[PDB]
Symmetry: C2
Subunit: 132 residues, 2 copies
């Protein structure tokens, strides 16, 4: 059992407890206090890894499962702050959309690439790259 | 006004007569013979031109307004032979998907590019380019 697997399991678990609500005032704060202390550390770990990418982080944070209610999870803003950092990096590189497509591992999905939760991010980068 | 415009207008009008079912046997044969005689010539002209691209041909052949039933027009298969030739050209050159994107002029459509009748062709070339 790995540290990252357990921690992520705990962040998915904590997110459900916050989405259900009806928590004691001190209990909800103690959960939100523990979540806030995991933001910087997970965001920095994901940015330094060569194997971590958005579709994987989406899955490990519980957002894939949530489907259309993914934005209701406390972990959405964390995933958001991660993709924001990636787009900032790729823009500083002036990466081409074809390079971004491989960063997002969309090449491995074949014909299912358009169904990826990363796909709207890829399309926006591609359009912005080419908007004269 | 111009010869090219008039010929394309006859291709659209001849296509409508076939689809509309009012022709005798002999008039049907004669319209289909005339249409066949235009096939190689239009194909060569569009492939030789640097300013002709699929979305444009699709419109000048009357397909855009047909939507999904565009395949019912006799001109659909002329359009398809044109995009087959393009796809085989770009595949032989090993042109990158980013290059294919601006060959299709999808860059001019910005956030509306995904609604382009050429978009599935782009997505297919892109997926096929990065397979393994």
């Amino acid at each position: 059992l790995g540290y990252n697997t357990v921690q992520l399991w705990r962040m998915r678990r904590t997110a459900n407890k916050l989405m259900n609500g009806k928590l004691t005032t001190q209990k909800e704060a103690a959960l939100k206090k523990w979540m806030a202390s995991q933001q910087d550390k997970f965001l920095a770990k994901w940015l330094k890894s060569s194997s971590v990418y958005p579709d994987q982080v989406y899955s490990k944070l519980g957002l894939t499962k949530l489907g259309a209610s993914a934005k209701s999870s406390p972990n959405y803003q964390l995933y958001e702050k991660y993709t924001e950092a990636l787009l900032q990096r790729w823009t500083n590189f002036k990466a081409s959309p074809d390079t971004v497509y491989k960063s997002l591992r969309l090449d491995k999905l074949g014909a299912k690439a358009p169904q990826s939760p990363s796909y709207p991010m890829y399309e926006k980068y591609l359009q912005t790259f080419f908007r004269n």
